[PDB]
């Protein structure tokens, strides 16, 4: 068996599996073992199809650590036109065995760079967010037909008002994938004459030879004369394979290596900074021990021993701000929905009932009061009349346990005594039943969280004594006989209750005593610490990070304290209420109609109610605060409290709100739903009957040792703890919030400044109805990768998501507010999206976008000038002389009797259908059927050419050989007919093909040409020839292979803002994620 | 609008929403008007949701 954690094991394979949790080399989540008994408890993930003899993890945990084997890149090079050439050197010969020449690049006529997300990878759990691109000869409209053009009149085009939204969602998917730590996988030494003595990497799988040439362009030699074999001759030779390995290791393989392989800087930078984020959450099992020992408030001592290592990682450390923002999201979940509050309070009630040493026995009242009694002979006795109300039955005491559980959640739900627990019809002193109803009510009131409970306690008696004693009031319509249930808001508090000197003891000698007893002996609030502040954080809004505001005072706990302790606050309260109820009856000033002297029976049974023994005022004062302190850090919804006040009318919290907008802005008042309550939160009725029975009867077992009971009861609910999964989830929530405020401000008008990278991609001033639809796709893309099925950013989407910073606040009575604004820490997914937006600003081409505009005009010639890159002869602008800019009111008047038809210049003139023109793109969508009726005969035949200024546009290609005829009208007119007022089909080009030998010279007619430089996604033309005579030539791009051709360059160096490189250092890891073990020992 | 067809009413409501391709009298009117006076331009959003 195991001597570390003292667990009994059976097979030696199970011993080698069990020491792996301790870190000794030889599907669980937590593995705890007790010290006094033999019962290990093991958590396991809840999505398993066959759970057995184990415990479940019902929290929605995110999948943080996810590994990757394979190439760390996202750019693949595809061939577009295949073309094989005659070859000089065919194969290598060692002795007799022949080896085929494998090329790193596709030997084709035209090679281009397309973007497929990871395209060669071995992954245990995919993120389900792929940016997959077809080659540019195929259609490329489904990538932009994604978010908001869901009603489109043309199902093959994309809405031009939504380019920025679709592109930002694409960049969010590109950053939200490649969230992988790559895996160290094992090597193999080479002795090829072109790669001599270099430990090359080898992928896992059936064959390792498959990927060597695709990785390493150096490894293929220079056997012949071609565009690759004059490149490898320029390349350098000592930079391939492993560069630097770790020192410490296990077995033979190292902990981390630096390898040279094909990659790209844009992926390896995102993965490096993602690793740098996850390494900053690393926790120590010694800190786990400190956390649980400090959190248990004594009563146990955990321990978690381990073996010394560095490669383990246990990401569990967050900051207080990242905890508080997720607390604000959990508060915004509710929105006056009592359904999302009910199971929380009910299950905390059941748990708090089953932990507690106290059982509420029924027999204490029954061994004293005796239903028999019949003092008089006419009607019921006082002793038999109180039992008909108390009803000491064993139904339940949920109205007591939920009242205890409601102390934790003050700013959400408030506990009151239900209506029709008060005296019926106002009540009168002259009746027997209403006195006991007032007794039950005034004994049950001080456990509610209602801050107007003392005013209700006073005005129930002041309502009951109408017609015997008079008090002054203030209004002449809020008289003395107003029902005590209606005093639920602190503006209703009477001045006669506030200053008790105005109650004259001549007129009200009993109401004066009651108003004095409330102001003297009402219970005092107090506070106690819980949890750990340094580890686990603290979700405490408006309170210091380790306090638990209780509405009752507490002393240190012992069991041998006397029951009739009048220093105890609730016992003092019971004694004073019984004494005033005695002094009311003693005189018979207030009960005429009692034809017999019931004052002896009444005074005797009130003496019995005063001197009853019950250890619930002992329990609520000693052992209930430490149990709340033990339960409270292991909750899904950690306690949201708002400060308790005793009688301070100047500070009573009346309203709690959550603010989405910024600080230095003035917008519409978007008050949250939680402000629309009469009380501070959702109301909650409780029965005073069961609360009073619970106070009057409750005892311990006779063999109560606290160090046995609590060390026993703490252990299973810490074995099923869920603090760790919540700490993992709050990072994802607090990261998604900042991702939302960074991405929505790019497409809407918000004064919040973040860096504004792409503007030339056109879009619209988005309203709330558009921004909410955008943010819903952002939300589900955040959820799909991190494997969640519960809330994330979903309370944000309840109208106006155009927001800046979360903030929460309440106000007092006197108007003083409190604004708690948690500072936003460093986000990671947001500034990775900003980095890839900066990089997309420089390669707009590789994702299928061009800059600039379109010139539609007939160019008929022989030349091979490749309309992705035009000469300056054909292009013009606003500054070109003799060019007519057209505004919005382009109006066409027909010519009469042979005159030419004219169109309205924006300067007010009329110009004929001739020359160099300028459109905005919006005009052609305003009048798409009227225009091509008028303009197509002049573009095709006449001298009319038109600039269409549009910013960004997707595009597709059509190659032709220039040995034959070519005409672009059947494509150009097909593009111009299909532009509808709500979408654009992707702009069709045709560029020539490149050849090595010289060709014929056939005429061609081109209409749609670009204006600025666009031929960047093209990798290399005619890759196997020595050169390219006719056509657009392109060598291998030497600026992307920097660390192979620049001899003075450190291998870390990356030119990532300007152009991403495709080969650099990447660092592969072999970490360990052990489960979370502890040995829970009991304390004497 | 609520009703059988709100498709018809969107040209009755907004005259300056149409395009101006013509030198017809309707379009001579619409081409000489102010752009930013359509739809809602003021609101009172007192509570979220």
């Amino acid at each position: 068996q195991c001597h570390v954690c003292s667990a009994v094991l059976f097979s030696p394979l199970d011993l080698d599996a069990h020491v792996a949790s301790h870190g000794l080399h030889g599907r669980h989540i937590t593995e705890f073992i007790s010290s006094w008994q033999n019962h290990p408890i093991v958590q396991v993930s809840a999505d398993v199809e066959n759970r057995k003899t184990a415990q479940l993890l019902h929290a929605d945990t995110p999948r943080l650590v996810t590994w990757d084997a394979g190439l760390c890149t996202s750019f693949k090079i595809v061939p577009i036109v295949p073309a094989q050439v005659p070859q000089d050197v065919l194969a290598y010969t060692f002795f007799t065995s022949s080896y085929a020449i494998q090329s790193p690049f596709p030997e084709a006529a035209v090679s281009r760079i397309v973007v497929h997300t990871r395209w060669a990878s071995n992954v245990d759990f995919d993120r389900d967010s792929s940016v997959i691109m077809a080659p540019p000869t195929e259609n490329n409209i489904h990538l932009f037909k994604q978010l908001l053009n869901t009603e489109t009149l043309s199902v093959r085009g994309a809405n031009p008002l939504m380019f920025r939204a679709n592109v930002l969602h694409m960049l969010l998917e590109f950053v939200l994938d490649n969230l992988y730590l790559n895996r160290h996988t094992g090597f193999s030494q080479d002795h090829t004459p072109f790669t001599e003595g270099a430990n090359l990497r080898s992928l896992p799988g059936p064959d390792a030879e498959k990927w060597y040439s695709i990785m390493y362009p150096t490894r293929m030699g220079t056997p012949n004369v071609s565009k690759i074999c004059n490149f490898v001759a320029s390349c350098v030779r000592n930079r391939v394979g492993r560069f630097d390995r770790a020192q410490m290791m296990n077995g033979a393989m190292s902990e981390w290596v630096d390898v040279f392989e094909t990659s790209d800087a844009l992926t390896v930078s995102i993965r490096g900074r993602w690793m740098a984020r996850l390494a900053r959450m690393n926790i120590n099992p010694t800190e786990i021990e400190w956390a649980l020992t400090e959190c248990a408030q004594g009563y146990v001592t955990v321990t978690s021993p381990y073996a010394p290592s560095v490669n383990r990682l246990m990401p569990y450390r967050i900051s207080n701000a990242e905890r508080q923002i997720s607390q604000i999201i959990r508060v915004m979940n509710i929105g006056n929905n009592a359904t999302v509050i009910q199971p929380v309070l009910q299950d905390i009630s059941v748990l708090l009932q089953r932990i507690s040493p106290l059982q509420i026995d029924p027999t204490i009242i029954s061994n004293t009061m005796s239903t028999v009694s019949e003092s008089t002979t006419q009607t019921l006795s006082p002793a038999s009349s109180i039992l008909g109300k108390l009803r000491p039955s064993n139904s339940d005491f949920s109205s007591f346990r939920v009242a205890l559980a409601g102390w934790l959640y003050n700013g959400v739900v408030t506990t009151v005594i239900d209506d029709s627990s008060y005296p019926k019809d106002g009540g009168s002193v002259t009746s027997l039943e209403n006195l006991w109803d007032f007794f039950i009510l005034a004994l049950a009131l001080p456990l509610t969280t209602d801050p107007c409970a003392p005013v209700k306690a006073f005005m129930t008696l002041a309502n009951m004594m109408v017609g015997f004693e008079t008090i002054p009031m203030d209004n002449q319509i809020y008289t003395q006989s107003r029902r005590a249930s209606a005093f639920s808001t602190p503006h209703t508090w009477p001045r006669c209750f506030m200053n008790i000197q105005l109650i004259s003891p001549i007129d009200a000698p009993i109401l004066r005593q009651w108003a004095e007893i409330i102001h003297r002996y009402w219970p005092n609030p107090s506070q106690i610490r819980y949890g750990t502040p340094n580890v686990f954080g603290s979700a405490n809004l408006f309170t210091p990070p380790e306090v638990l505001l209780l509405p009752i005072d507490h002393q240190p706990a012992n069991v041998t304290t006397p029951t009739l302790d009048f220093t105890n606050e609730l016992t003092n309260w019971r004694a004073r209420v019984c004494e005033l109820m005695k002094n009311l009856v003693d005189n018979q000033r207030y009960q005429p109609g009692w034809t017999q002297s019931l004052v002896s029976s009444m005074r005797g049974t009130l003496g019995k109610l005063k001197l009853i023994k019950s250890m619930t005022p002992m329990y609520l004062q000693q052992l209930a605060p430490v149990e709340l302190a033990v339960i409270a850090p292991m909750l899904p919804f950690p306690p949201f409290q708002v400060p308790y006040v005793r009688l301070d009318r100047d500070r009573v919290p009346t309203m709690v709100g959550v603010t989405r907008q910024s600080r230095d802005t003035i917008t519409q008042p978007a008050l949250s739903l939680s402000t629309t309550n009469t009380t501070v939160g959702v109301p909650l009725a409780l029965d005073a009957r069961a609360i009073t029975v619970a106070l009057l009867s409750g005892k311990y077992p006779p063999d109560l040792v606290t160090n046995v009971w609590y060390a026993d009861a703490i252990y299973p609910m810490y074995a099923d703890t869920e603090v760790f999964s919540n700490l993992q989830r709050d990072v994802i929530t607090c990261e998604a919030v900042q991702t939302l405020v960074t991405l929505v401000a790019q497409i809407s008008e918000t004064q919040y400044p973040v860096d504004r990278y792409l503007d030339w991609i056109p879009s619209l001033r988005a309203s709330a109805a558009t921004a909410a639809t955008f943010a819903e796709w952002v939300n589900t893309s955040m959820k799909t990768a991190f494997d969640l099925s519960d809330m994330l950013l979903e309370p944000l989407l309840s109208g106006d998501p155009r927001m800046t910073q979360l903030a929460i606040q309440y106000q007092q009575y006197n108007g003083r507010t409190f604004n708690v604004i948690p500072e936003m820490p460093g986000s990671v997914i947001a500034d990775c999206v900003q980095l890839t937006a900066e990089v997309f600003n420089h390669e707009y081409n590789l994702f299928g976008i061009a800059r600039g505009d379109i010139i539609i005009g007939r160019v008929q010639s022989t030349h091979l000038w490749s309309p992705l890159a035009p000469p300056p002869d054909l292009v013009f602008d606003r500054d070109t002389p003799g060019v007519h800019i057209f505004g919005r009111d382009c109006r066409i008047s027909f010519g009469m009797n042979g005159a030419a038809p004219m169109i309205r210049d924006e300067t007010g003139m009329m110009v004929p259908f001739e020359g160099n023109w300028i459109f905005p793109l919006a005009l052609w969508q305003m009048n798409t059927r009227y225009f091509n009726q008028q303009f197509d005969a002049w573009i095709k035949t006449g001298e009319l050419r038109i600039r269409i200024e549009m910013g960004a546009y997707p595009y597709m290609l059509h190659y032709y050989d220039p040995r034959q005829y070519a005409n672009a009208w059947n494509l150009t007119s097909a593009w111009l007919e299909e532009i509808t007022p709500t979408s654009i089909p992707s702009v069709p080009f045709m560029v020539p093909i490149s050849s090595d030998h010289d060709i014929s010279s056939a005429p061609a007619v081109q209409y749609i040409i670009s204006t600025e430089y666009n031929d960047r996604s093209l990798f290399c033309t005619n890759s196997s020839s020595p050169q390219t005579i006719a056509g657009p030539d392109k060598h291998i791009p030497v600026e992307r292979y920097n660390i192979l051709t620049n001899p003075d360059a450190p291998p870390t160096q990356i030119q990532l803002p300007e152009v991403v490189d495709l080969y650099n250092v990447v660092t592969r890891y072999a970490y360990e994620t052990p489960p979370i073990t502890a040995v829970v020992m009991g304390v004497p | 609008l609520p009703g059988p067809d709100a498709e018809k009413w969107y040209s009755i409501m907004y005259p300056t929403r149409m395009g101006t391709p013509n030198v017809s009298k309707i379009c001579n009117f619409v081409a000489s008007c102010v752009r930013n006076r359509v739809g809602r331009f003021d609101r009172a959003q007192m509570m979220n949701g």
Binding site: R929 | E7, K8, G19
Partner: peptide
Amino acid sequence: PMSTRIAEATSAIVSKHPA
């Protein structure tokens, strides 16, 4: 619903081919 409300606003003003 919002999809119907947007689709009517876009389909209220479209234009077709001549006869």
